[PDB]
Design a protein around this motif. Structure first.
Motif, short mmCIF file in Angstrom:
data_model
loop_
_atom_site.label_atom_id
_atom_site.label_comp_id
_atom_site.label_asym_id
_atom_site.label_seq_id
_atom_site.Cartn_x
_atom_site.Cartn_y
_atom_site.Cartn_z
N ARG A 3 15.03 -37.35 -24.46
CA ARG A 3 14.46 -35.71 -25.32
C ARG A 3 15.47 -35.97 -26.36
O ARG A 3 16.13 -35.80 -26.63
N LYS A 4 14.26 -34.88 -27.14
CA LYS A 4 14.51 -34.39 -28.26
C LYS A 4 15.03 -32.96 -28.80
O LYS A 4 13.56 -32.30 -28.57
N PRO A 5 16.10 -32.57 -28.91
CA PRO A 5 16.58 -31.48 -28.65
C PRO A 5 16.06 -30.22 -29.69
O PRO A 5 16.00 -30.62 -30.58
N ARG A 6 14.70 -28.95 -29.25
CA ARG A 6 15.01 -28.20 -29.98
C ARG A 6 15.87 -27.01 -30.27
O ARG A 6 15.30 -25.98 -29.55
N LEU A 7 16.31 -27.00 -30.52
CA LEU A 7 18.53 -26.74 -31.05
C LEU A 7 17.74 -25.12 -31.75
O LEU A 7 17.04 -25.20 -32.99
N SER A 8 17.86 -23.70 -30.88
CA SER A 8 17.83 -22.46 -32.17
C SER A 8 17.88 -22.83 -32.57
O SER A 8 19.10 -23.42 -32.63
N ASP A 9 18.26 -21.31 -33.51
CA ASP A 9 19.30 -20.99 -34.20
C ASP A 9 20.46 -20.69 -33.66
O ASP A 9 22.20 -20.88 -34.37
N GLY A 40 21.55 -22.21 -30.75
CA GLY A 40 22.01 -22.82 -30.13
C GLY A 40 22.64 -23.92 -30.90
O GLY A 40 23.36 -24.61 -30.69
N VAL A 41 22.16 -23.97 -32.51
CA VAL A 41 23.14 -25.01 -33.31
C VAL A 41 24.59 -24.19 -33.62
O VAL A 41 25.47 -24.68 -33.86
N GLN A 42 24.60 -23.27 -33.01
CA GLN A 42 25.65 -22.22 -33.72
C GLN A 42 26.46 -22.54 -32.41
O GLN A 42 27.90 -22.64 -32.11
N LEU A 43 26.35 -22.66 -31.46
CA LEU A 43 26.86 -22.87 -29.99
C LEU A 43 27.63 -24.02 -29.89
O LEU A 43 28.67 -24.19 -29.79
N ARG A 44 27.01 -25.63 -30.92
CA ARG A 44 27.39 -26.88 -30.14
C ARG A 44 27.78 -26.84 -31.04
O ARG A 44 28.83 -28.16 -31.37
N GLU A 45 28.32 -26.54 -32.60
CA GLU A 45 29.01 -26.69 -33.25
C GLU A 45 30.33 -25.61 -33.09
O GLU A 45 31.66 -26.52 -33.00
N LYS A 46 30.83 -24.58 -32.09
CA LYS A 46 31.89 -24.19 -31.82
C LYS A 46 32.42 -24.66 -30.28
O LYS A 46 33.23 -25.64 -30.15
N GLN A 47 31.51 -25.86 -29.87
CA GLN A 47 31.75 -26.33 -28.41
C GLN A 47 32.19 -27.66 -29.77
O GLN A 47 33.08 -28.42 -28.35
N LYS A 48 31.67 -28.19 -30.31
CA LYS A 48 32.58 -29.61 -31.21
C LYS A 48 34.05 -28.57 -31.07
O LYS A 48 34.46 -29.98 -30.87
N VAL A 49 34.55 -28.53 -32.07
CA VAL A 49 35.29 -27.91 -32.40
C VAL A 49 36.67 -27.77 -31.12
O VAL A 49 37.84 -28.28 -31.14
N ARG A 50 36.42 -26.77 -29.73
CA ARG A 50 36.82 -26.31 -28.76
C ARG A 50 36.73 -28.37 -28.31
O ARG A 50 37.96 -28.47 -28.00
N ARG A 51 36.22 -28.66 -28.24
CA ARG A 51 36.80 -30.19 -27.56
C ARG A 51 37.12 -31.61 -28.23
O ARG A 51 37.36 -32.24 -27.16
N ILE A 52 37.51 -31.23 -29.61
CA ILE A 52 37.92 -31.86 -30.07
C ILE A 52 39.54 -31.78 -29.94
O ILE A 52 40.15 -32.61 -29.37
N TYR A 53 39.94 -30.52 -30.15
CA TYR A 53 41.49 -29.88 -30.09
C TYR A 53 41.96 -29.53 -28.04
O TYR A 53 43.02 -30.07 -27.65
N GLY A 54 40.41 -30.02 -27.36
CA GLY A 54 41.60 -29.39 -26.21
C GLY A 54 41.29 -28.23 -25.54
O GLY A 54 41.61 -27.22 -25.30
N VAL A 55 40.80 -27.39 -26.29
CA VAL A 55 41.21 -25.43 -25.64
C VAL A 55 39.70 -25.24 -25.01
O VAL A 55 38.88 -25.74 -25.49
#
Ligand SMILES: [K+]
Ligand SMILES: [K+]
Ligand SMILES: [K+]
Ligand SMILES: [K+]
Ligand SMILES: [K+]
Ligand SMILES: [K+]
Ligand SMILES: [K+]
Ligand SMILES: [K+]
Ligand SMILES: [K+]
Ligand SMILES: [K+]
Ligand SMILES: [K+]
Ligand SMILES: [K+]
Ligand SMILES: [K+]
Ligand SMILES: [K+]
Ligand SMILES: [K+]
Ligand SMILES: [K+]
Ligand SMILES: [Mg+2]
Ligand SMILES: [Mg+2]
Ligand SMILES: [Mg+2]
Ligand SMILES: [Mg+2]
Ligand SMILES: [Mg+2]
Ligand SMILES: [Mg+2]
Ligand SMILES: [Mg+2]
Ligand SMILES: [Mg+2]
Ligand SMILES: [Mg+2]
Ligand SMILES: [Mg+2]
Ligand SMILES: [Mg+2]
Ligand SMILES: [Mg+2]
Ligand SMILES: [Mg+2]
Ligand SMILES: [Mg+2]
Ligand SMILES: [Mg+2]
Ligand SMILES: [Mg+2]
Ligand SMILES: [Mg+2]
Ligand SMILES: [Mg+2]
Ligand SMILES: [Mg+2]
Ligand SMILES: [Mg+2]
Ligand SMILES: [Mg+2]
Ligand SMILES: [Mg+2]
Ligand SMILES: [Mg+2]
Ligand SMILES: [Mg+2]
Ligand SMILES: [Mg+2]
Ligand SMILES: [Mg+2]
Ligand SMILES: [Mg+2]
Ligand SMILES: [Mg+2]
Ligand SMILES: [Mg+2]
Ligand SMILES: [Mg+2]
Ligand SMILES: [Mg+2]
Ligand SMILES: [Mg+2]
Ligand SMILES: [Mg+2]
Ligand SMILES: [Mg+2]
Ligand SMILES: [Mg+2]
Lengths: 79, 86, 205, 81
Positions: free
Chosen positions: C43-49, C51-66
RNA sequence: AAUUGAAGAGUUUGAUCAUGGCUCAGAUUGAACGCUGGCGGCAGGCCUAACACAUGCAAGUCGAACGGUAACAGGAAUUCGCUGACGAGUGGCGGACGGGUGAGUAAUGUCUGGGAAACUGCCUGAUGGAGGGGGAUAACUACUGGAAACGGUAGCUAAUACCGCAUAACGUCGCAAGACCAAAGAGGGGGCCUCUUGCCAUCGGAUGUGCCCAGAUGGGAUUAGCUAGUAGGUGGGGUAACGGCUCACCUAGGCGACGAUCCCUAGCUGGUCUGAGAGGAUGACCAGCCACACUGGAACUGAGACACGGUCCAGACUCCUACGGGAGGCAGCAGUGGGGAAUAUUGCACAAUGGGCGCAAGCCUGAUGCAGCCAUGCCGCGUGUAUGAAGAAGGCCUUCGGGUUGUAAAGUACUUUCAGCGGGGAGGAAGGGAGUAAAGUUAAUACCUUUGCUCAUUGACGUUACCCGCAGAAGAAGCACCGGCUAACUCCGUGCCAGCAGCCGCGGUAAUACGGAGGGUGCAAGCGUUAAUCGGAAUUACUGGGCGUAAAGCGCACGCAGGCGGUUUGUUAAGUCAGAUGUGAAAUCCCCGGGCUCAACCUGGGAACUGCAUCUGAUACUGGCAAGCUUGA
């Protein structure tokens, strides 16, 4: 020198004693407006020279009765 | 009393009370004689009774039964009243 | 206290490669990278504002493993430190020992470099340090212990590091298997697809 | 009487003493008159493990302040630089 | 370097804008509950019944003050205090500290800043003394009362116990002259000397305590009057000291809308939580202050108490009794019962820090240092790493093509933190005791003191931290949520039922909202729920709101208190401003550092404590005082 307050005689009906009102001018802690506050001290008045209305001059001393711990220095202005 | 040293302190303080009480009574008896003579308005006798009182209150102050300031107060108060008896 | 599940579902949720595999293959040869995981992943996610802030934080966390509690504490320190908060937060994540060990080439991934740190195979200025979140200072020397110089994964990791862009704030000697941390990486030395201002705004919500 | 002693602070298994002037009746970590130094017994090398204001200590000793035995030893090692 | 700081959303209408409440997202906690649970570090742990408490322990010490000898240990021969020593006793000091609790207390207390009329053990400085006598008493001995607790009678004995006498001036009283007041010895050594230590007087220091004043510190006016020792004065008494502290007399005052009195609630502060800030809330742990010690009351002793583990009286409870009479007080530590949603072991050690006593050795110390219990909080770590398409099985979905779970697993390579096992091994220890030699003292190579050196020793924690070795992925993942706010969707079951719910609302046979499942999202040794505080709430608005119609202008005036005040000059320096000094405890917060592998945590130094007081200046503005002016009246 000696610390010293100055106020106005509001009562002289005691023997050798007077009530003196001292006015202070302080900023209200919340609203910032400068307001007038009053303190009434019982003052020792040997010779019984002061009358109701005079602007006097007092200093702090040892206790002289239950409520008196101030004594008359001089009269600045007579009514 | 539950503690051994508390028991002894009770015995000791009671013995000290009786000892103190007899001396306190003795001193007060001598002071009263000066006041009694002043009442009668007899300066000769009042000055006499003052004179044996004076070593009494001084020794008791040194022994710790009264304070020096108290001994001094009695001597001052009685002297002031004796001298006005003229 | 550590994510222990599939590694590519993470990168598939974030819609980009998180360098969670060594790199011997292509991320599209192991998974459907451009598709989010799950039954409804197409599906095509309609990310709220939010949701866009959240996914950016989860990205940086998942890179470094924190994890979140540790990450929130990094943010508090980044905001306390003088300067640009968003850049301070990236400099703190790049100072971690397990990250520095990986950027030096001693580990194929950040998880492997973390196992090397945890299993007591790394030294900082000459002392064993097994804390993955240890902060590496400028001029510090990170090195492999002698009993671990013979491990076959440390050379397999050193042969994949030159296949990637060389970090210019470090200085590795693949021979003696030791590097120097010369300075904190500037914001320019770090990736540009990380929008750290979204993280700073998320923690003011 | 007025004494000069160590108040135990720091953490568990890692004591850190403050050198204080105090009425001896007060609790060890309680009311004190003036702090005049510290003493770290597990200090690392190159770290200052003991600092005393000997001019303040000498000032209080001149007013009748006694000194605890451990502070007496600390004054000696400090004077024996 | 030490102010880098501020988000909205839902819901009233057919729709709209406004107004306005309600609700939500955040942070936090001495938490509790449900589900789940690997390790470590640091902290925290009766918030309720200041309810009642079994048992053990929490205050002793000194023989270098004294008579002594119950021991046991020697010396002497069942005998001798003759020695090391020491039960009971006299005497000294401590028991007023340390520890607990928050009942009472709304200013009696606390906080800040001032002040005068005071005392102060131990410690410390100075100057002088320490002469000569006396009468007792416990212990002990004899007899004796009582069930016991506890006593009675007689006789003997010691002191640094007690009391005269002498001495008496920088002391006390007095204008003066004068008058008057103290004391104790003990210990080491020596051809009585000497040293050490203690005793008394006065004057200082330091510390502690008592007292006074001003400002600050909750709510209530559907509490407006209160007060006769009441307010002041004189004189006597009293206190360490000022004082209606107390008494007699005189005056008739004193307090109060700047909130007295009365009522309700409450320990206060440093701080803590929240907040962009201003504020709001709060006062557990840690530190300062106060109050209390079964309930009510009282004093005695003492430098200090109206005394937590002292005394006396009364009371309620518990207990003993021979029925006459006696005993007790966990809000010390541990523990029990009880209450409660709820809060731990009847542990080890004085090794360290500190306290009491002692010349010291040492003894005592539930202070303290540690250990046990509990995910209660904070912080760190682990529960594997890399590879691996057969895109396997099985599950779920499917327009039956497939999609998904999913590189996930299996497989194949690897590592071994932590846990387990074995081995090694810091630091917290400073000291004290024996020796010595030197120096200081002395008549003295003696004693003692000091400073070096020498020799053996002191760790509760403890199987310490930490290091090395062995083995094998081997021992280690859950909880809530997925209609919107709000990150995450399908099927089946059910059919206004069962049920969900913070709100909008959902459920009536095609439910993304109930229940299961597959898939997903968020946190993770935790996750949810409940309670509670601040936030969002500019929704009490000082910063920072309103009142024509949304809630809100008194029906209209006059007017005391109060608030405010045209213009000019001079003066004053209260407000205001500048600077200085003192203070604003430490911890906490913040900045730059340092130390534990990291972090939490500990710690050095700064900043800050936005206040108060004093001093010295400035004079525009505001105020006071003096003199005007004419435009307001
Ligand atoms: K005794
Ligand atoms: K509605
Ligand atoms: K609204
Ligand atoms: K005492
Ligand atoms: K209370
Ligand atoms: K004598
Ligand atoms: K009175
Ligand atoms: K009077
Ligand atoms: K406050
Ligand atoms: K009471
Ligand atoms: K006590
Ligand atoms: K001890
Ligand atoms: K399959
Ligand atoms: K299949
Ligand atoms: K059906
Ligand atoms: K306003
Ligand atoms: Mg008077
Ligand atoms: Mg008098
Ligand atoms: Mg954690
Ligand atoms: Mg309680
Ligand atoms: Mg004995
Ligand atoms: Mg005597
Ligand atoms: Mg004499
Ligand atoms: Mg309050
Ligand atoms: Mg008074
Ligand atoms: Mg009087
Ligand atoms: Mg109360
Ligand atoms: Mg606000
Ligand atoms: Mg007394
Ligand atoms: Mg007591
Ligand atoms: Mg008790
Ligand atoms: Mg208890
Ligand atoms: Mg119960
Ligand atoms: Mg005992
Ligand atoms: Mg040692
Ligand atoms: Mg959504
Ligand atoms: Mg259905
Ligand atoms: Mg459901
Ligand atoms: Mg508000
Ligand atoms: Mg409004
Ligand atoms: Mg209307
Ligand atoms: Mg209206
Ligand atoms: Mg009108
Ligand atoms: Mg009018
Ligand atoms: Mg004007
Ligand atoms: Mg001024
Ligand atoms: Mg401070
Ligand atoms: Mg460091
Ligand atoms: Mg500091
Ligand atoms: Mg002016
Ligand atoms: Mg003017």
């Amino acid at each position: 020198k000696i610390r010293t307050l100055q106020g106005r005689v509001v009562s002289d009906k005691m023997e050798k004693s007077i009530v003196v009102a001292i006015e202070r001018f302080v900023k209200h802690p919340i609203y910032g407006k400068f307001i007038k506050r009053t303190t009434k001290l019982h003052v020792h008045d040997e010779n019984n020279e002061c009358g109701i209305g005079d602007v006097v001059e007092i200093r702090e001393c040892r206790p002289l009765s239950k409520t008196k711990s101030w004594t008359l220095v001089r009269v600045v202005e007579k009514a | 009393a539950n503690i051994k040293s508390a028991k002894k302190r009770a015995i000791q303080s009671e013995k000290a009370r009786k000892h103190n009480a007899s001396r306190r009574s003795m001193m007060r008896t001598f002071i009263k004689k000066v006041y009694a003579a002043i009442e009668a308005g007899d300066k000769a006798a009042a000055q006499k009774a003052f004179n044996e009182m004076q070593p009494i209150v001084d020794r008791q102050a040194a022994k710790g039964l009264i304070h020096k300031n108290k001994a001094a107060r009695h001597k001052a108060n009685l002297t002031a009243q004796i001298n006005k008896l003229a | 206290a550590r994510y222990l599940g599939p590694k590519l579902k993470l990168s598939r949720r974030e819609g980009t490669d998180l360098f969670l595999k060594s790199g011997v293959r292509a991320i599209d040869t192991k998974c459907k990278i451009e598709q989010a995981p799950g039954q409804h992943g197409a599906r095509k996610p309609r990310l709220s504002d939010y949701g866009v802030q959240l996914r950016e934080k989860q990205k940086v966390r998942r890179i470094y493993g924190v994890l979140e509690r540790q990450f929130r504490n990094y943010y508090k320190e980044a905001a306390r430190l003088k300067g640009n908060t968003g850049e301070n937060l990236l400099a703190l994540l790049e100072g971690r020992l397990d990250n520095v060990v990986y950027r030096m080439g001693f580990g194929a991934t950040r998880a492997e470099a973390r196992q090397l740190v945890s299993h007591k195979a790394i030294m900082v200025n000459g002392r064993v340090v097994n804390i993955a979140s240890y902060q590496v200072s400028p001029n510090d020397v990170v090195s492999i212990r002698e009993k671990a110089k013979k491990q076959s994964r440390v050379k397999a990791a050193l042969e994949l590091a030159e296949q990637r862009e060389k970090p210019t704030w470090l200085e590795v000697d693949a021979g003696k298997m030791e590097g120097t941390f010369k300075r904190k990486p500037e914001r320019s030395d770090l990736s540009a697809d990380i929008n750290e201002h979204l993280i700073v705004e998320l923690y003011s919500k | 009487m007025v004494t000069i002693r160590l108040a135990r602070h720091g953490a568990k298994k890692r004591p850190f003493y403050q050198v204080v002037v105090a009425d001896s009746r007060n609790a060890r970590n309680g009311r004190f008159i003036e702090r005049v130094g510290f003493f770290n017994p597990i200090a690392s090398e190159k770290e200052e493990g003991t600092r005393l204001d000997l001019d303040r200590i000498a000032h209080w000793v001149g007013q009748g302040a006694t000194i605890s035995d451990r502070v007496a030893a600390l004054i000696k090692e400090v004077n024996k630089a």
